[PDB]
Design a protein around this ligand. Structure first.
Ligand SMILES: [Zn+2]
Ligand SMILES: [Zn+2]
Lengths: 125, 125
């Protein structure tokens, strides 16, 4: 019933797309496909600002109305493809993540540099 | 007081930054700086979806639920720097443009190709 998407890019080879879906006020399903990553674990976070004026550093700190979506795993080919179900990622209401940012980190979830990021935007239901 | 920003990019030479500011429920101040434009008038619109998975076409239609910000003017050097005031751009509430898209068009306000676009995101202050 509510959907969002983020296109991730940064000052690196890392690119991808994340789709988010939430039915009513239930859990948010997050579909991740990110390429160009070093094989292994990468922290995956919601950060507070949908601001990329200064690259991924403009996105501020992790979002804490919560912001930690855990690790995503890149395979030998640099691809991280996974579906997550996270209950703390509203698409509506006071704590909505719409207009905030998703960031993929260089190192495993505590972090390292912010490899890529994208603003969370509304998308057709 | 709420603020938003959009970084605009597209399949073209056009890029820039737009900030939006709103106090209580009143008029929204829009600060524009876009470069790489052909000199003259360019349609400047709010579109429905902050979805750039298919470039600027995936932002959908111009959004009203208002979405027509009029023209911006690119100077001899392709720079359009202007401050607009618009009372149809909520940054809060049911009609928030947060998570939607700003689009700059090839031609004067209908508007030809979508030269550049960006997702409207939250930013400090
Ligand atoms: Zn982080
Ligand atoms: Zn338009």
């Amino acid at each position: 019933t509510k959907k969002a998407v983020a296109v991730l890019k940064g000052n690196s080879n890392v690119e991808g797309v994340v789709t988010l879906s939430q039915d009513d006020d239930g859990p948010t399903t997050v579909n991740v496909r990110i390429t160009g990553l070093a094989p292994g674990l990468h922290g995956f976070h919601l950060h507070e600002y949908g601001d990329t004026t200064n690259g991924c550093m403009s996105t501020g700190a992790h979002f804490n109305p919560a912001g930690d979506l855990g690790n995503i795993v890149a395979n030998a080919d640099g691809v991280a493809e996974v579906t997550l179900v996270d209950n703390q990622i509203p698409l509506t209401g006071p704590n909505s993540v719409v207009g905030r940012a998703l960031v993929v980190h260089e190192l495993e979830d505590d972090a390292g540099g912010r490899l890529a990021c994208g603003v969370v935007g509304l998308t057709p239901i």
